[PDB]
Design a protein around this ligand. Structure first.
Ligand SMILES: NC(=O)c1ccc[n+]([C@@H]2O[C@H](COP(=O)([O-])OP(=O)(O)OC[C@H]3O[C@@H](n4cnc5c(N)ncnc54)[C@H](O)[C@@H]3O)[C@@H](O)[C@H]2O)c1
Ligand SMILES: NC(=O)c1ccc[n+]([C@@H]2O[C@H](COP(=O)([O-])OP(=O)(O)OC[C@H]3O[C@@H](n4cnc5c(N)ncnc54)[C@H](O)[C@@H]3O)[C@@H](O)[C@H]2O)c1
Ligand SMILES: NC(=O)c1ccc[n+]([C@@H]2O[C@H](COP(=O)([O-])OP(=O)(O)OC[C@H]3O[C@@H](n4cnc5c(N)ncnc54)[C@H](O)[C@@H]3O)[C@@H](O)[C@H]2O)c1
Ligand SMILES: NC(=O)c1ccc[n+]([C@@H]2O[C@H](COP(=O)([O-])OP(=O)(O)OC[C@H]3O[C@@H](n4cnc5c(N)ncnc54)[C@H](O)[C@@H]3O)[C@@H](O)[C@H]2O)c1
Ligand SMILES: O=C1N[C@](c2ccsc2)(c2cccc(Nc3ccc(F)cc3)n2)CC(O)=C1Sc1ccccc1Cl
Ligand SMILES: O=C1N[C@](c2ccsc2)(c2cccc(Nc3ccc(F)cc3)n2)CC(O)=C1Sc1ccccc1Cl
Ligand SMILES: O=C1N[C@](c2ccsc2)(c2cccc(Nc3ccc(F)cc3)n2)CC(O)=C1Sc1ccccc1Cl
Ligand SMILES: O=C1N[C@](c2ccsc2)(c2cccc(Nc3ccc(F)cc3)n2)CC(O)=C1Sc1ccccc1Cl
Lengths: 331, 327, 331, 325
C-alpha cells in the first residue's frame, strides 16, 4: 500500500473529462495575459496551452500550476501536440509571426496564413464543436482565414476585432467626463486598428446622446476636438508599443470578458469581428466588427447599427481592402 | 459651456485622500503580476506604480488603464517621483538589481537606501510587503531603514514555497491544494524547512500514518515533494527566464488579508529574535496572523531538534551577511 | 499558560478603527437581503445590524456569523444601541413601521417620519462622515426627511429611488429582445413606484436608439405596445407582493450594486433619488430620481437628461405632490 | 418588420441543452438562501425552483428574475411540474414537513419528489438538506437507485462551519485558518474530532492533552456544546436558520460544479467503516467533484469516537428498518 491508499478510500475510479475547457494557442505576452485573466475569473475547469517553443510553454504551464492554491481551475495542461486541447468549448488563437525587418505587410500576412494552416486543422480535429476566438493580427483577415480553413459555421468563428479599440475609447471618454468607462457608452466598429470607425451617434451617458447635445461631435469643426478621442485610441496603441514593446494586460482582460459571455451563455452585446457580407452593401467574404450577441453558440445574433453614409463608405472601403489582400492568399 | 458641463451638473469637486491605496515598487515581471492579481481581486480603490525605467513604467500604467472597463479600481497612477504613492495602506517592494554574493545583497541594499526613505515620507503609516531577494535579508534592510515597528514590515518569505508544496502534495494525493495542508518555514528558497508534523488532510497527520515521512529511508520518497519545490524554481527560470504568475497570485493573497483585516494565518517572514534559540535581528518565516496592522500575532510551531537547528543555521548565515552591510 | 497563549504569540493588541464598515438599519426581508448581497460581494470589513426587535436582530446576526467560513467580512455585530454602528462609511436605512393601519392614528408617512426622527440623529452621532442610503418607503419623501434631520450635504444623502424600477425595466426589455439586461439600456426616472417615468429616448442596445428605429415606441399608437414594458414594471411589484407577501432579493441585489460604487469609488451612473431643486422647472426641496455619479463622496455629480414636455410635466407633478406632503411635516 | 427584427439579425435559432443547471426543491427559508448564494457565486447557467405552494414559488422566481441585471445566471425558471428541472447537473433537496411519524411524513414527501427528479435528470448529483438529513439521504439513495457517489447529504457541513466560527472567536483567528472536524450524525449527536483540531498544522490536542475531556480546565468541550446550543438559540430568536446553511450548501455546490476535489464533511454511505455493518449515512471528510463523492478520508478515531458513530448507526438503522417505501 501507499500513504495515499492509507489516507484515502476510493469509491469510484471513473476517469472523467472536463465540462468547461478552454485552450490558448500561443504563450506570448497576449496569450499569457488571456490565460491569467481567464484563470482569475473562474471561467474554466481545465486550461490547455499550446505553442511551438517547448521550453517557454512548459515554464508558463508550471508557473500557472504553482498558483493553483489561489485558483479554482483544477487542471492546467500544455503541449506541442493538440491532443492536450481535446473537447475544448473555446479555443483562443494568439499565435503569430514576428515582423522580420524589411518584410512587406503582405509577406507577414502570408506567414500568419502558413501558421494558421497548421493550427486550425489540429484545433478542429480535437474540438470540432468549439468556438474559435481569433486575436492574432491582422485580426479581420486571420478570422476569415480561420473560418475558411476550419469549415465552421460563421457563428463559431469570432474575431477579437474592435473589442480593445472600444475599451480604449470608453477609457478616454471616461477620463474626459470624469465617469467610470462602464457608464460611458460608445462603439468603435469596422476594421480593427488604424482604419476603425467611431460611431458618434451611439456615444452616450445614461441614454443621453452626446451628438444631440453637441452637434459638432466627431467633426473637424468641433472646438472641443472630440474626434481626438478616437485619434488617441490609435495613438495610444503605438505609444504602448513604443514605451513597453507590446500590449498584454488590456487585450487579456478584453478577451476574458468575451470568454465570460461565451462560457456562461450570457447573451451580452460585444464589438467583435464577424462575417459582414450582406451588410452595408458589402458583397465580399470579409470579417468586420459590429455589436454581436455572444453565448454558448458563439455569435447567435448581431445588432444592425444604423450608420451614416460616411460611416457606411468607411466600412465598404475596409471590406474592399481586406478582400484585395485575401484574394491573393495561398491556402 | 463645455459638453461635460452641459451633460453633468457638479455637486462638489472635493477629492478625498486615498482610502484603500496600494503601491507596487518595481514594474518587472514580478511587480506587474502582483499588479494584475491585485486589480482582478478588487483589493484597492487606487493603484500606484513606481520604477526607475520611465518608458516601461508609463507603458505598463497605460496598458492597465486601457483595461479599466473590465476592472473595479478607478484610479491607476505611476511615476518616478514618490508623490504618486502618497497615503498608501500597503506598499509592495519588488524592485531588484559570478558576483561576490555579499555584493548582490549590497547592490539591493543600495537600491533600498533610495526607495525606503521615499516610501516612508509619503506613506508613514503603511504596511511594507517585501518580495525582492534575498527576501529575508531585504525585509530586515527595509525594517532597519524605515524605523517601522516589526508588525508593519512583512516579508513574502515562504508563502510561495508553501503554495508550491501544497500544489505538489495535491498532485500526489489527487486532492485540491486548498484541502492539502502543509507548512514550509524558515529561510525562503534553497534553505527552507518542510514541517512534516503539520502535513495533513482533514486533520489526519501524514507523519502519524507514515513515520518515515520526510526521511531519506522513506520508500515513497515524500522528501522529494520539498526537493521538487526548490528544483521547480530553477526549472521555471531555466524554461521561461523568470517566475511571475505564482508569486503574483501569492502576494495578492497576502494583500487580501491585510486590506480586508481577515486575520488569516500565512507563512511570511517576520522578526524571529527570541524564538528557536535565535538571538540575532533576523527575519524568518513562521505562520503569521495578517490584518490591518500587518503581523499582529504569530503561531508558535513546535519544531523537532533537526528543524530548530536548520532555522538556527539560516539565522547565523543571514546575520553573518547582515552585520557586514553598509547602510 | 492557556492553550491560546501556548499556540499564539502576540506582537501587539492595538484596537483599530474599521476601514470599510457598513451598517444596515432594519433587519426585515429587505434589510437582510441587502446584508447577504453586501456580504457575498466583499464590500465591507465590518457589518453592523440595528433594529428595535431584539430577538430577531440577535438571531439574524448569529445566522450570518455562522456563515463566516464562506465569507471575507471578519466582523459581524448587532445591537439596539447605535454604538455598534460607530465609524460606518455607508449606512443603509430599510426600517419601516408595521403596514397594519389600525396600529396607529398616524399614516404610513407619519409613522416612517417618526421612526427616522429617532434613527437619523443616532446614525449621525456615531458616523458623522457616512453616506446615507435610504430604502424605506415612500423613498423620495424619506430621503428628504433623512437630509433635513441629518443636516448632511446633499451629496451624502442618497435615495434608492428608481434603481429597482430601472432594473425590472431592463429585465423585461431583455426578455423581449433576447439580450442580457446588462446590454439593454433604459432609464426609469422621477418618483419611485407607481408614478415613475420611462425615458423612451434613451432606450437602446449598442447605442442604437429603439425610438429612432420605431417612432411609435412608448405611444398608445404602438402596435407592439412597448408602453406595456413600463406598465409591467409596476404590475410585477404588486404581483410579487400578492404571491410571496414582500420583495427581498431584487431590492437587496440593487442596493449592493449601489453600495459597490460608493465603497469602491467607481463613479458609475445609477438612477437614484437626489435633491432635484434647480431642474425641470422644480423650485421646491424635493428628491427625485435622475442618473447620478456614485463614489466615495456619494453623489458628486448628476446627468442632465433631456426630457420631453410630457416627461417634464410628470416629474413636475410628482414634485408638487411631494412638496405638498413635505410642507405639512413637523420637525 | 418588428422592432426586434429591425434591431437584430439572427444567425441561428439552435437552443442547446443547459450546460451547468442547478435545481432547488423547496422554496422555504433554506431553499431560497441556497438559491441566492448559488446565484451570487455564478455556479449555474440555469436555476430551476420547485415547490407544492404555487403562489410562493412564482413570487420567489419573479423576485430573483428581477435581480438579473446584477447576476450572471441568464435563465431562472420555476414550476410544480418537474419538466422545469430537466438536465440538471445538481439537484438540491430542501423540501420537508412523534419522531418515526415525522420521518415517515418526510419519506412520503420523498416518494413523490425523488422519482420525478430521476425522470428528468437521471445523471444528476443529489444533495440532501432536509432533516433528519442522514435518514433522508438514505431514503433518497434507496428511492433513486443512484450509485452512492451521486447521493450526498449536507450532514456535518454546517456543524463544522459553526465549530470553526466558535474556534476562531476563542483564538482571535479567521475561521478559514482554524481547522477542525465535526463528524458522524448531523445535529445533537455529532462528534468533534479533537485530534484534528489545529492552526497551521499545530495540533491543539498535542499542546493541550486534556482537550475535549471533562477534566479540561479551559473546557474546550464547550465549543462543540455551543454548536448544538447555537442551533436552538437561532430557532428560538428568529424561528429558523437560513443564511449559514445556504452559504454552506453553495460551497458544496462550488466543489461539485467546478470539479474542485476539495474535502468537505458530508454524509455518505459508511457501511464497512468503524465496525458499522448497516446501510446508514454518516458524515466523514469526502472529496467532492463532478461525480459527487469519488473518495473519502479515513480519519483515525479513538475507541470513544468510534463507539459514538456506532451508536448513531444503530439508532439510524433502527428507524430505517421500520420505514414504509
Ligand atoms: N486583436 C487585438 O486587439 C490585438 C491586440 C494586441 C495584440 N494582438 C496580436 O496578438 C498576436 C500576438 O501577440 P504577442 O505580443 O503575444 O506576440 P508573441 O510573438 O510574443 O507571441 C506569439 C506566440 O505565438 C507562438 N507561435 C508562433 N507560431 C506558432 C504555431 N505554429 N503554433 C503555436 N504557437 C505559435 C510564438 O512562439 C509565440 O509564443 C499578434 O499577432 C498581435 O498583433 C492583437
Ligand atoms: N520572495 C519570492 O518568493 C520571490 C519569487 C520570485 C522572484 N522574487 C524576486 O523579486 C525580484 C524581482 O523580480 P523580477 O523578475 O521582476 O526582476 P526584474 O529585474 O525584471 O524587475 C525589477 C524591477 O525593479 C526595478 N528597479 C531597480 N532599481 C529600482 C529602484 N531604485 N527604484 C524602483 N525600481 C527599481 C527595475 O527597473 C526593474 O523594473 C527579484 O529580486 C526576485 O528575486 C522573489
Ligand atoms: N425603495 C425600494 O425600491 C423598495 C423596494 C422594496 C421595499 N421597500 C421598502 O423597504 C422597507 C422595508 O421593507 P420590509 O419588507 O423589510 O419591511 P419589514 O416590516 O419586514 O422590516 C422592517 C424592519 O424595520 C424595523 N424597524 C421599525 N422601526 C424601527 C426603528 N425605530 N429602528 C430600527 N428598526 C426599526 C422593523 O422592526 C422591521 O424589522 C419598506 O418601507 C418598504 O416599502 C423599498
Ligand atoms: N442539514 C442541515 O444542516 C439543515 C440546517 C437547517 C435546516 N435544515 C432542514 O431543511 C429543511 C427545510 O427547512 P425550512 O426552514 O426551509 O422549512 P420550510 O417549511 O420553511 O420550507 C420547506 C418547503 O418545502 C416545501 N415542500 C413540502 N412538501 C413538498 C413537496 N412534496 N415538493 C416540493 N416542495 C415541498 C414546503 O412547501 C416548503 O416551502 C428542514 O427539513 C430543516 O430541518 C437542515
Ligand atoms: O495595441 C495594439 N498593439 C499592436 C501590437 C504591435 C506589436 S505587439 C502589439 C499594434 C499597435 C500599433 C500598430 C499595430 N499594427 C499592426 C498591423 C498589422 C499587424 F499584422 C500587426 C500589427 N499593432 C497590436 C494591436 O492590434 C493593437 S490594438 C490597436 C492597434 C492600432 C490602432 C488601434 C488599436 Cl486599438
Ligand atoms: O521561483 C523563484 N525564482 C527565483 C528567480 C526569479 C527570477 S531570477 C531567479 C529563483 C529561482 C532559483 C534560485 C533563486 N536564487 C536566488 C538567490 C538569491 C537571490 F538574491 C536571488 C535568487 N531564485 C527567485 C525566487 O526566490 C524563487 S522562489 C524559490 C527559489 C529557490 C528555491 C525555492 C523557491 Cl520557492
Ligand atoms: O416591489 C415593491 N414592493 C413594495 C412593497 C409593498 C409591501 S412590502 C414591499 C410595493 C409594491 C407595490 C406598491 C407599493 N406601494 C407602497 C407605497 C407607499 C409605501 F410607503 C409603501 C409601499 N409597494 C415596495 C416597493 O417600493 C416596491 S418597488 C415598486 C412598487 C410599485 C411600482 C413599481 C415598483 Cl419598482
Ligand atoms: O440550525 C439548525 N436548525 C434546525 C431547524 C429547526 C427548525 S427549522 C431548522 C434545528 C435546530 C435545533 C434542533 C433541531 N432538531 C431537529 C431534529 C430532527 C429533525 F428532523 C428536525 C429538527 N433542528 C435544523 C438543523 O439541522 C440545524 S443544524 C444543528 C441542529 C442541532 C444541533 C446542531 C446543529 Cl449544527
Amino acid at each position: 500500500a501507499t500513504l495515499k491508499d492509507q489516507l484515502i478510500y476510493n469509491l469510484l475510479k471513473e476517469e472523467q473529462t472536463p465540462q468547461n475547457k478552454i485552450t490558448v494557442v500561443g504563450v506570448g505576452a497576449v496569450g499569457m495575459a488571456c490565460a491569467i485573466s481567464i484563470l482569475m475569473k473562474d471561467l474554466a475547469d481545465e486550461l490547455a496551452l499550446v505553442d511551438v517553443i517547448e521550453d517557454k510553454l512548459k515554464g508558463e504551464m508550471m508557473d500557472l500550476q504553482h498558483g493553483s492554491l489561489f485558483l479554482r481551475t483544477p487542471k492546467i495542461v500544455s503541449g506541442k501536440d493538440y491532443n492536450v486541447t481535446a473537447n475544448s468549448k473555446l479555443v483562443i488563437i494568439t499565435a503569430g509571426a514576428r515582423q522580420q525587418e524589411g518584410e512587406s505587410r503582405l509577406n507577414l500576412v502570408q506567414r500568419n496564413v502558413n501558421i494558421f494552416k497548421f493550427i486550425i486543422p489540429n484545433v478542429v480535429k480535437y474540438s470540432p464543436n468549439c468556438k474559435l476566438l481569433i486575436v492574432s493580427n491582422p485580426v479581420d483577415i486571420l478570422t476569415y482565414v480561420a473560418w475558411k480553413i476550419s469549415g465552421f459555421p460563421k457563428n463559431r468563428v469570432i474575431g477579437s476585432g474592435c473589442n480593445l479599440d472600444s475599451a480604449r475609447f470608453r477609457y478616454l471618454m471616461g477620463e474626459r467626463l470624469g465617469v467610470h468607462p462602464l457608464s460611458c457608452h460608445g462603439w468603435v466598429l469596422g476594421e480593427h486598428g488604424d482604419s476603425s470607425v467611431p460611431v458618434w451617434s451611439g456615444m452616450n451617458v445614461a441614454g443621453v446622446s452626446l451628438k444631440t447635445l453637441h452637434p459638432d461631435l466627431g467633426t473637424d469643426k468641433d472646438k472641443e476636438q472630440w474626434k481626438e478621442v478616437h485619434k488617441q485610441v490609435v495613438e495610444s496603441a503605438y505609444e504602448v508599443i513604443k514605451l513597453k514593446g507590446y500590449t498584454s494586460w488590456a487585450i487579456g482582460l478584453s478577451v476574458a470578458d468575451l470568454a465570460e459571455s461565451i462560457m456562461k451563455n450570457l447573451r451580452r452585446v460585444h464589438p467583435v469581428s464577424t462575417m459582414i457580407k450582406g451588410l452595408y452593401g458589402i458583397k465580399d467574404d470579409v470579417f468586420l466588427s459590429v455589436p454581436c450577441i455572444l453565448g454558448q453558440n458563439g455569435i447567435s445574433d448581431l445588432v444592425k447599427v444604423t450608420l451614416t453614409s460616411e460611416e457606411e463608405a468607411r466600412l465598404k472601403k475596409s471590406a474592399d481592402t481586406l478582400w484585395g489582400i485575401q484574394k491573393e492568399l495561398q491556402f
